[PDB]
């Protein structure tokens, strides 16, 4: 995509004791216009991997289709091997880099979260194939607004419980709504644990003080 058309805003992610949490607002902006306000920007890749994406939504849907089909193909064999979150992270890095080399990039910034073999995974992939794994991630304006809060807490306390991570994510999403001009009140929270992947319905940051 030379020029993105409908895009999603920041996507957050923080790993806790026995899982990972990812959040993303349900809003596709057509360049400073809240056009589509009820679109999910989080995907359940498989039983132990989820994915949230910023940037062009059309490119995200294409990756959703390609990644979904590949997971189906692997499950058909029934050989007892499943793509780990790290493997999906590796594949996405190669896919994004290959498109960049061809000068036809996939205008997306993806956050991968998973839990396999008793170990949380949280990965980052950019439009140009830049990839790394960190305890917390935030794309778009979240790298400026939300990332400072997550890093500050994690440095003080490396290990978080699920409740602490959920509260931290909620606070960060509130900050993004206050300051980011391409954000929306409604958002989703996806959690991956030993019991699989769960996506919470459309939440809200109604706890928004407006003391002017």
């Amino acid at each position: 995509t030379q020029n993105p058309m409908v895009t999603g805003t920041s996507v957050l992610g923080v790993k806790f004791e026995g899982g990972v949490v990812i959040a993303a607002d349900m809003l596709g902006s057509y360049g400073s216009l809240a056009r589509f306000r009820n679109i999910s920007r989080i995907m359940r890749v498989n039983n132990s991997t989820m994915l949230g994406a910023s940037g062009d939504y059309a490119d995200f849907q294409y990756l959703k289709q390609v990644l979904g089909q590949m997971v189906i193909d692997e499950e058909l064999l029934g050989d007892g091997h499943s793509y780990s979150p790290r493997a999906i992270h590796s594949w996405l890095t190669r896919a994004m880099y290959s498109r960049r080399s061809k000068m036809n990039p996939l205008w997306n910034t993806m956050v991968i979260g998973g839990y396999a073999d008793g170990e949380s995974f949280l990965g980052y992939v950019d439009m140009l194939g830049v990839a790394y794994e960190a305890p917390s991630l935030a794309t778009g304006y979240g790298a400026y607004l939300a990332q400072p809060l997550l890093r500050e807490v994690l440095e003080k306390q490396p290990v978080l419980s699920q409740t602490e991570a959920r509260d931290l994510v909620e606070r960060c999403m509130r900050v993004l709504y206050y300051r980011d001009a391409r954000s929306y009140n409604r958002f989703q929270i996806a959690t991956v644990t030993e019991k699989g992947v769960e996506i919470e319905g459309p939440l809200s940051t109604e706890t928004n003080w407006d003391i002017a």
């Binding site: 030379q2 080399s101 830049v130």
Partner: protein, 212 residues
């Protein structure tokens, strides 16, 4: 759409009589933000060879994977692991293979030669390389090189005995140069990773730097 982005990073290699040292900072950045603080830039290739890559992380990941694949291909077809000199020659061809879309990567190889003595090879983004005794590359190369030449090369110093460089002295030099670089270069900091190559094996050490 620009297919390149500078992610920072500083690398350093010192060759000794019976050892080789490769060190790098563990910060990854983009623009004015910090992607992560725990991404070492030193990659172990064989039991006696290490490579340090810095620049565009998208190219750094792809190049390291290609080198890892090529090392395995050589071993299969030749029934012997590649030497440091062979790796440097191969990397030069790989880098020049993209002379019209080059890898935005600065590489420095370090390891033992066939005789058991430390060897260091420094590369340009397009392939040109030389067998040096010590080199620095990346964001703070201009800061690191002058002191290494003075202290390791004994340049501009008269009536000074040219005692062989010791492992302990080399380790102290590596720590000092990176500490000074952290105080002045914005792109280098977080932590310092040091890989020591000897006949026994590859040893690793980490020391904290400033967090900006």
């Amino acid at each position: 759409f620009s297919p390149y982005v500078f992610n920072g990073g500083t690398i350093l290699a010192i060759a000794g009589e019976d050892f080789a040292i490769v060190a790098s900072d563990t910060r990854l950045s983009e623009g004015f933000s910090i992607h992560t603080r725990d991404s070492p830039k030193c990659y172990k290739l064989t039991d006696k060879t290490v490579i340090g890559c810095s620049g565009f992380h998208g190219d750094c990941l792809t190049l390291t994977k290609i080198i890892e694949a090529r090392l395995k291909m050589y071993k299969h077809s030749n029934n012997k692991a590649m030497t440091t000199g062979a790796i440097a020659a191969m990397l030069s061809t790989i880098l020049y293979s993209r002379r019209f879309f080059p890898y935005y990567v600065y590489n420095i190889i370090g390891g033992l030669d066939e005789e058991g003595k430390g060897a260091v090879y420094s590369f340009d983004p397009v392939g040109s390389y030389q067998r040096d005794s010590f080199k620095a590359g990346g964001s703070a190369s201009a800061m690191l090189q002058p002191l290494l030449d003075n202290q390791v090369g004994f340049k501009n110093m008269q009536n000074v005995e040219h005692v062989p460089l010791s492992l302990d002295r080399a380790m102290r030099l590596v720590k000092d140069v990176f500490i000074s670089a952290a105080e002045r270069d914005v792109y280098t900091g977080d932590a310092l990773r040091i890989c020591i190559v000897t006949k026994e094996g590859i040893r690793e050490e980490t020391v904290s730097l400033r967090k900006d």
